[PDB]
Amino acid sequence: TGRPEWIWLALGTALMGLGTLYFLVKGMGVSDPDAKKFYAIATLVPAIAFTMYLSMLLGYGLTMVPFGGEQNPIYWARYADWLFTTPLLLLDLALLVDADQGTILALVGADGIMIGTGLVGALTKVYSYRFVWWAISTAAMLYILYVLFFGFTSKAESMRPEVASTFKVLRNVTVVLWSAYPVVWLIGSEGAGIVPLNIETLLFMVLDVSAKVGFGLILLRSRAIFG
């Protein structure tokens, strides 16, 4: 097929793979139980992304959806990825600040909605309805971000400064990167079709990698993961 976006996907496949192996090798060495906990979670994240980037690189996870008079290319493998990686990332922030079970469940549930409605919207054939779903998905995301900024940060102040400071960074990177996804979707192939697929894939790969390997590197090299 040789599609214009394949290179970004070949690049993102390689970064997710490298990041996975490094986190894997580093965590197989750690003896502390909950350091292990954080390692196990942070390694699985890019591992999943890798498999998905790799499947897409290989021609899977792609579907043509009809709307706006065109046969639009929609990479659904993405949601298969995010469906499990996004909640895992949230779990990590939750474990860091000792979030409560109820909080966690609510975050993972909101997260389920966000990716679910997102996909439904990416698949919708009535142009204008694609944005209704998008809207809902974004609302869900905002709920998540609100909790993290208002809820979590608050509980991160019952921990040691080292832990609170590691959390604020991770919280920050997350707020900035996550915020970007809905905008990329809106102006990209799934939305207005203004940014071409190849550039769109480049944006997502930069965000996916930053948010997973970038997030992992920061968290794992901190002593806040120790019991």
Shortest Å distance, C-beta 76 to ligand RET: 11
* Burial profile 136-146: b = 16 or more Cβ within 10 angstroms, e = fewer: bbbebbebbbe
Site for ligand RET, residues 102 to 121, rule: CB under 6 A: 114-115, 118
Rg of the Cα atoms in the chain: 18
Q: Does 50 bind ligand RET (CB under 6 A)?
A: no
- The single residue among 19, 61, 87, 182 that binds ligand RET, judged by CB under 6 A, is 182
54, 13 Cβ separation under 8 angstroms: yes
The helix (H) or strand (E) run that includes residue 158 is none
Least CB distance from residue 169 to ligand RET, whole Å? 15
| Closer residue to ligand RET in complex, CB, 21/30 | 21
20 binds ligand RET (CB under 6 A): no
The site that binds ligand RET (CB under 6 A) totals a number of residues, namely 19
d(CA 172, CA 212): 14
What is the distance between the alpha carbons of residues 97 and 164, in angstroms, rounded to a whole number? 8
Residues forming the site for ligand RET (CB under 6 A): 49, 82, 85-86, 89, 114-115, 118, 134, 137-138, 141, 178, 181-182, 185, 208, 211-212
